[PDB]
Amino acid sequence: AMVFSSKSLALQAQKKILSKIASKTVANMLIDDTSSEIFDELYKVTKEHTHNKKEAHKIMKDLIKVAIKIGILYRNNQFSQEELVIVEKFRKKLNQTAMTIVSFYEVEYTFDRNVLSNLLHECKDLVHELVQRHLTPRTHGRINHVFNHFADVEFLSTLYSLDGDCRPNLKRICEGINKLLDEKVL
Amino acid sequence: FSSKSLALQAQKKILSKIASKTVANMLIDDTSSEIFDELYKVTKEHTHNKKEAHKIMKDLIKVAIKIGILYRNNQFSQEELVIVEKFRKKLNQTAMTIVSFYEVEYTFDRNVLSNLLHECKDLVHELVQRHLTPRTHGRINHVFNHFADVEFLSTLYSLDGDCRPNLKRICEGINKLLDEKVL
Ligand SMILES: [Cl-]
Ligand SMILES: [Cl-]
Ligand SMILES: [Cl-]
Ligand SMILES: [Cl-]
Ligand SMILES: [Cl-]
């Protein structure tokens, strides 16, 4: 009874396309197991700091979304020349802040929450510049929600404070970060 | 909580959304899907092999989609982008000729249209030559050798045949896409 339909053929092909995507994605994640681990730790710290399991989940969800968005733009060459210049700037800034985080951990007396806050703000601004010509509905707000939370001096003080209960987390975080610096992911 | 799980999800989702929007813009469109449906009808009426018509349209749709995805994902190199522009111009020219040959009966030259179609084929081959799967090449050939075939075109344009209403619809659709600057 059903007659020929090109729409049907197209949707049939799309089925296979979507399966292949599922595969490729599983085999080539934009986010490393190491990068994810760091994310789980920032998650736990976020929990302890906000005592709001769901605000934590929201924050991390958003962060992962923005990250994935940037990764997809960069993998699909959506970035212009100017924008690639901004990608490099962001690479540098991110390297600086990661080493600053690790150093504030490994070397006591050096931790300044204002310095690290300032750096994270610089990261945020770079991300904004990066997605200006590519901004979906929810993004801008996700960017601010994530980076304002991580550059809040009190979150940082919580993460680093010795008289706290995150020390172990900050450690695994810095271990991860050092792995990524080594592999030159960061 | 597993960031790895949320990241898996999110990446799959964005990639999938992109893929399906590409498919929708290309083929799901009403005017476009109707044109392809008519092309099916005319190739069935020309071959009297339902199955073979289906195969032709299926290769057409597979190649069309493959190219749509290479395009949206910026998978084409600079030279390749030169070739895409050339292909859009050649495809535009052949659309306009399809329409003119119909609108003005006496000006129908099956060899002109055929040669335009082979030009399109050459440009498609040139365009995907570095992005082949083990079957793309032959699909391109099957489709274009079928539509460029002078006998096919004669069946399509024959004023005494039964493909005239199809042709008229095909040309209506084509005119729509021309006006929308799709084609
Ligand atoms: Cl969104
Ligand atoms: Cl290139
Ligand atoms: Cl005559
Ligand atoms: Cl004739
Ligand atoms: Cl005739």
UniProtKB/Swiss-Prot annotation, chain A:
GO cellular component, one term: plasma membrane
Coiled-coil annotated residue ranges, if any: none
Listed GO MF terms: phosphatidylinositol binding; phosphatidylinositol transfer activity
Broad class of where this protein is predominantly found: cytoplasm
UniProt keyword list: Cell membrane, Cytoplasm, Lipid transport, Membrane, Transport
Family, similarity comment: Belongs to the TNFAIP8 family.
Reported function: Acts as a lipid transfer protein. Preferentially captures and shuttles two lipid second messengers, i.e., phosphatidylinositol 4,5- bisphosphate and phosphatidylinositol 3,4,5-trisphosphate and increases their levels in the plasma membrane. Additionally, may also function as a lipid-presenting protein to enhance the activity of the PI3K-AKT and MEK-ERK pathways. May act as a regulator of tumorigenesis through its activation of phospholipid signaling.
Protein name: Tumor necrosis factor alpha-induced protein 8-like protein 3
UniProt organism field: Homo sapiens
Lineage: Eukaryota, Metazoa, Chordata, Craniata, Vertebrata
Encoding gene (name): TNFAIP8L3
Residues of the full protein shown: 109 to 292 of 292
